């Protein structure tokens, strides 16, 4: 690692290379940890962090690492559910933090833009929304999530039924491969270009930039919220949502969240985004979902960019500038998810409601996100993300807790157990053989490389088919061509072929 450091100085700037002796080290590392439970002293620390400022720096890191046997991890904005962008287990590593490469240059008239991978979804949103009210981009709702990790793993949000995933809307890209070669879509090839758009970027290289396709939105859209605190009534409505939500027009997004209310009781929160006017939303909802009981008072017409702040839980009429904040979260979490292919029984709905009444589920959520629309229109093979037609909705079980509590691992166990238990309960009701999982919600509990099988291929196949289903074999083929040394690897990365 010593020579490695020297190798970097042979130009890669001195003051973008951090090690433990640098006063500005634990701060650089701690800054973009967006799951605080993985910021504890007992978790593995890197022996160096590099914050590149030009592409050439990244190249040098890739080339020098391989030359001196140094393992790396790449961080954009650090929302990895298991912290695998700044944690490597059982072998010393360094971190390529992309915080300095976040330049966003749009071409609003040609509906494209280049987005450097250090940028957050919020920054991208801000750049678009401040410039034009008639364009958008389909990514997640949480502004501090980086485009690096999110886009390379798929990326859904309130426009998925209309426009699909973020990865479904990328038309070129720059990646540094195991050589240190900077490759655009033309230079990298279609197989490479495919793999990086959902396959999990940590398996394929260092993605430097995305070329996005901007999508059209009306200057006026409509959001709505309906709250149901009565279990009986809410369970009734959720049953109906299960049949309606994935079949409504592409313009209508209806999410169901089960969680605590301010009055410390379980409720069902139905929130949505309609790509059109309020009267059209209302007529559509009495037709397809009159059980929700939506009325004008539950609705609000605003711009799409304003709907971003809305879904991101900011005060109404807040300045768009909050999209640009990259502040550290204070809530640790454990998340798992599932895909539902046919409506779960009323009995299932009541039980998962019941489990949220648990004391340790006070900051927990069960979130039901409707697919259908563009999501069933697109075929499995089109991008590595496999969960298309046949999936009614995706469901995430996530428990949050205050980072203070992390001081006693034994105490935060109850949250893990909570999340594990509801997931186990849901087994008979969700997809099976394989049980589908979303790679942007990384879960070591589905399996990791430890030495269970002879080769990495047979061991990695285990969780591989859960994340990627029938797309797993292609990813492995692409992986074998583009990265035959297997330089880019973590605890769940795509394996080389046998
Ligand atoms: C933190 C979070 C995440 C999240 C969410 C809510 C919160 C609080 N809700 C989501 C949702 O509603 N919909 C959705 O699609 N995703 C949601 N997530 C998950 C989030 O998208 C993923 O965690 C995403 O992968 C995180 O991306 P980010 O860039 O912020 O995180 P990272 O730790 O730095 O990276 C994660 C993995 O990707 C690799 N990576 C990152 N950058 C690159 C580049 N440029 N090249 C190659 N690989 C890259 C990391 O190595 C890591 O494995
Ligand atoms: Cl998100």
Numbering used by the authors: 28 to 37, 43 to 530
Excerpt from the publication:
Among these, the flavin-dependent oxidoreductases berberine bridge enzyme-like enzymes stand out, because of the bi-covalent attachment of the cofactor to the protein via a histidine and a cysteine. Here we report the crystallographic structure of AtBBE-like 28, a member of the type II BBE-like enzyme sub-family. AtBBE-like 28 functions in biomass formation and salt stress tolerance.
Crystallization was conducted using the sitting-drop method, yielding crystals diffracting to a resolution of 1.8 Å. In the case of AtBBE-like 28, the cysteine is replaced by His174, which does not form a covalent bond to the C6-position. However, the covalent linkage established by the conserved GGHD motif was clearly seen in the crystal structure (His111 in Fig 3). Asp369 and Glu426 are found at a distance of 2.4 Å, indicating that they share a proton. An additional interesting feature of the active site is the proton-relay established between the putative catalytic base, Tyr188, and the neighboring acidic side chains of Glu426 and Asp369, which presumably activate Tyr188 to facilitate proton abstraction. In AtBBE-like 28, this position is occupied by Val177 and thus we assume that the pocket is available for oxygen binding. In agreement with this assumption, an electron density in this pocket was clearly detectable and we propose that a chloride ion, acting as an oxygen surrogate, is bound to the pocket (green sphere). The distance between the chloride and the C(4a) of the isoalloxazine ring is 3.1 Å. AtBBE-like 28 features a hydrogen bond donor to N(5) (Nπ of His174) and a catalytic base to initiate substrate oxidation (Tyr188) and hence shares the hallmarks of a flavoprotein oxidase, as proposed by Fraaije and coworkers.
